[PDB]
Amino acid sequence: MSALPELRELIASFVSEEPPEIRRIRTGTVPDLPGSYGQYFTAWDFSNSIVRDYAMNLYQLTRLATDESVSVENLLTVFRTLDPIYSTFLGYNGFPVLAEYAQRVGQPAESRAELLDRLTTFTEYVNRLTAWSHHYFPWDLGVDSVDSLGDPSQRIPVRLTWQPLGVQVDAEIYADLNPQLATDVLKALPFTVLQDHAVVSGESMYAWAPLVSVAPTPVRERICDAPVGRLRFSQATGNKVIVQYGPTTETLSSPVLGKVVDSHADRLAEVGKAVWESTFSSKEPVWLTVERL
Amino acid sequence: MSALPELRELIASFVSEEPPEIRRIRTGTVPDLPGSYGQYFTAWDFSNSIVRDYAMNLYQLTRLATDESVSVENLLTVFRTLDPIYSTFLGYNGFPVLAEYAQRVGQPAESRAELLDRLTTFTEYVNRLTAWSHHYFPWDLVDSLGDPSQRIPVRLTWQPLGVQVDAEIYADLNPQLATDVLKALPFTVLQDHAVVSGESMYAWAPLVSVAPTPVRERICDAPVGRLRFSQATGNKVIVQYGPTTETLSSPVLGKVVDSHADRLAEVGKAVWESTSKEPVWLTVERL
Numbered sequence: 001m002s003a004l005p006e007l008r009e010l011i012a013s014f015v016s017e018e019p020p021e022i023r024r025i026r027t028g029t030v031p032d033l034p035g036s037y038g039q040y041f042t043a044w045d046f047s048n049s050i051v052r053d054y055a056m057n058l059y060q061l062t063r064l065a066t067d068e069s070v071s072v073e074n075l076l077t078v079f080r081t082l083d084p085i086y087s088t089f090l091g092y093n094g095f096p097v098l099a100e101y102a103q104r105v106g107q108p109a110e111s112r113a114e115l116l117d118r119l120t121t122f123t124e125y126v127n128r129l130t131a132w133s134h135h136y137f138p139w140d141l142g143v144d145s146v147d148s149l150g151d152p153s154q155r156i157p158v159r160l161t162w163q164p165l166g167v168q169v170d171a172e173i174y175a176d177l178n179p180q181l182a183t184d185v186l187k188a189l190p191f192t193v194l195q196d197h198a199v200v201s202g203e204s205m206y207a208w209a210p211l212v213s214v215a216p217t218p219v220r221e222r223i224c225d226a227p228v229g230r231l232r233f234s235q236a237t238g239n240k241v242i243v244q245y246g247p248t249t250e251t252l253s254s255p256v257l258g259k260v261v262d263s264h265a266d267r268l269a270e271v272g273k274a275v276w277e278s279t280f281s282s283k284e285p286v287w288l289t290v291e292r293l
Numbered sequence: 294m295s296a297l298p299e300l301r302e303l304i305a306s307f308v309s310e311e312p313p314e315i316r317r318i319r320t321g322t323v324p325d326l327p328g329s330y331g332q333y334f335t336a337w338d339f340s341n342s343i344v345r346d347y348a349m350n351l352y353q354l355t356r357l358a359t360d361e362s363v364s365v366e367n368l369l370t371v372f373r374t375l376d377p378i379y380s381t382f383l384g385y386n387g388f389p390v391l392a393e394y395a396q397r398v399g400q401p402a403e404s405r406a407e408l409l410d411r412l413t414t415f416t417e418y419v420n421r422l423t424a425w426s427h428h429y430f431p432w433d434l435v436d437s438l439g440d441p442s443q444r445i446p447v448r449l450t451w452q453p454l455g456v457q458v459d460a461e462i463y464a465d466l467n468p469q470l471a472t473d474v475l476k477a478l479p480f481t482v483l484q485d486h487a488v489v490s491g492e493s494m495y496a497w498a499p500l501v502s503v504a505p506t507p508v509r510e511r512i513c514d515a516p517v518g519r520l521r522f523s524q525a526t527g528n529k530v531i532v533q534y535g536p537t538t539e540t541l542s543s544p545v546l547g548k549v550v551d552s553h554a555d556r557l558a559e560v561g562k563a564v565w566e567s568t569s570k571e572p573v574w575l576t577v578e579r580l
Contacts, residue, residue, distance in 0.1 A: 032538055032540060033538055034489050034538060034539070035488075035489055035538075036486065036487055036488050036489060036490060036491050036492070036493075036565065037491075037492075037565060041432070041434060042432050042488035042489055043488075043489045045338070045342070045432075046488075046489050048342075049338075049342030049343075049345070049346060050342075050346060052342075053342070053343065053346030053347075053350075053379075054346075056375075056378055056379070057350065057375060060371075060374045060375040060378070061375075063374055064370070064371060064374055067370060067374070069366065069367070069370060070367045070370050070371065071364075071367065073362075074362060074363045074364070074367050075371075077357070077360055077362060077363055078357060078363065078367075078368075078371045081353040081356055081357055081360075082349070082350055082353040082354075082375075085349055085353065085525045085526075086346075086349070088540075088541050089541060092539060092540045092541060093489065139332075139334070139335050139338075141334070141434040142332055142333075142334020142335065142337065142338065142431070142434065197329065198329055199328070199329050199335035199339070200327045200328055200329065200335050200336045200339050200386065201327075201329065202329055203329075224325075236378040237378070249325040249326060249327055249385075250327070250385060251325065251385050252381055252382065252385060276329065276330070280329075280330070
């Protein structure tokens with residue numbers, strides 16, 4: 001069935017509409033008034049950061065609900081230690097409903113039924129809150145080929161569309177490299193989600209996709225070593241579809257999803273300039289649509 | 294024997310000196326130059342936040358090694374699942390040694406004592422990295438319960454302010470917590486101010502108490518002069534000298550006597566601006 005049905009309508013509402021929480025935090029109208037000495041930028045820094053790291057904790061707890069070596073009640077114990085501290089502080093720092101649903105996950109309700117699904121739903125919920133926080137946070141104040149490796153018949157064509165940019169690139173999903181990962185993304189297609197730029201990785205863009213893929217990733221590519229047009233699906237940082245359009249420095253391995261065709265790789269730099277303008281200063285909503293051709 | 298004595302040497306040195314990582318991140322001397330565009334404040338904002346939120350993960354894992362229902366094979370599984378995304382990103386974002394010692398904690402610790410000490414040593418290591426990052430981060434952009442005779446006096450002195458209050462630790466309310474805190478006396482650690490609660494000051498103490506805390510007080514309900522030892526947010530001693538808004542309940546460690554509570558407002562005024570990022574030291578000692 002549905003773990004927390006009231007959450008699924010909230011995940012559906014927040015893929016397109018801004019959550020009231022991100023608004024009250026960014027406008028300094030959080031009810032309890034967090035922040036020291038007349039100012040709320042520091043509490044803003046703690047809401048942006050804690051809601052982000054909480055989401056990383058929740059995702060790995062979702063991956064743990066799949067591990068059968070870890071006992072079910074043992075996992076419920078682990079969840080009822082790290083989650084509480086993050087929840088009640090987020091409940092005080094502008095995320096009250098996030099705090100309330102966290103206790104509902106920390107319940108001995110059944111086993112696995114209320115472990116995997118509950119986290120999945122809640123993890124997708126907190127990743128959507130983190131998506132809007134990353135968008136509306138004032139960052140302005142401060143080898144061999146994997147593309148060749150693989151059956152050419154397992155390439156699934158997709159088109160990326162940025163509005164109101166009006167730009168469309170054509171990409172290719174690598175479905176034989178990470179089978180279940182590609183299946184998890186194609187079953188979520190099509191989706192239109194807010195587009196944001198990477199803030200530490202360099203010339204890269206990521207958008208939180210509406211899914212919680214727990215699929216294995218046998219093929220992973222180092223980010224800094226990714227070609228122009230690289231499609232990556234980072235499950236650990238919030239199930240994001242990442243499009244790299246230039247040089248990046250992050251040396252970590254992220255799952256490989258595919259790549260934009262070379263004829264359309266020239267149009268990614270302009271979109272990245274506009275999307276960086278969307279995350280760094282303007283805060284103007286640039287939407288991304290991934291769809292199957 | 295300690296699990297990682299070379300880490301214990303780093304924890305001892307960082308009480309008075311700034312870690313070499315915290316220096317380069319605050320100055321933008323990270324080797325691969327992280328951060329988008331030409332600015333590095335985002336890499337700074339991520340290093341301060343990720344290492345602060347990582348220490349909380351490490352502390353609850355340290356508390357999980359006391360749970361005997363969770364097996365050492367199971368705690369190592371939750372470690373080898375939740376740790377990498379935080380350790381490898383920190384290793385790239387200016388904490389390479391933190392990444393190195395993180396895998397060494399996830400080894401097949403033959404015993405729960407072996408794994409727990411790896412956690413306790415590493416938790417204090419990351420807690421001091423969070424302490425110096427919190428100090429140099431540009432943010433400018435129940436008393437009647439128990440018996441009085443069951444309470445131990447201490448003396449707090451802030452340099453170079455020269456301000457000295459006399460406090461009283463309630464050793465009967467949270468016995469294990471108070472015992473674990475007194476064992477660190479005397480200690481001189483950097484004093485910082487709270488940035489989200491209100492008029493409060495905390496300083497990271499050189500210990501990792503996982504002692505039970507039966508008596509916890511809501512911060513918004515805490516009187517002026519309240520001594521709190523929050524184990525979850527990095528084992529720091531907190532002195533509230535004015536109004537606070539945080540509604541979370543932190544363990545009660547003691548309180549500065551009413552006679553010297555008039556002297557706390559001045560220190561907090563010269564500590565809020567110190568967190569200017571100018572260092573201020575705190576010495577707590579047994580009288």
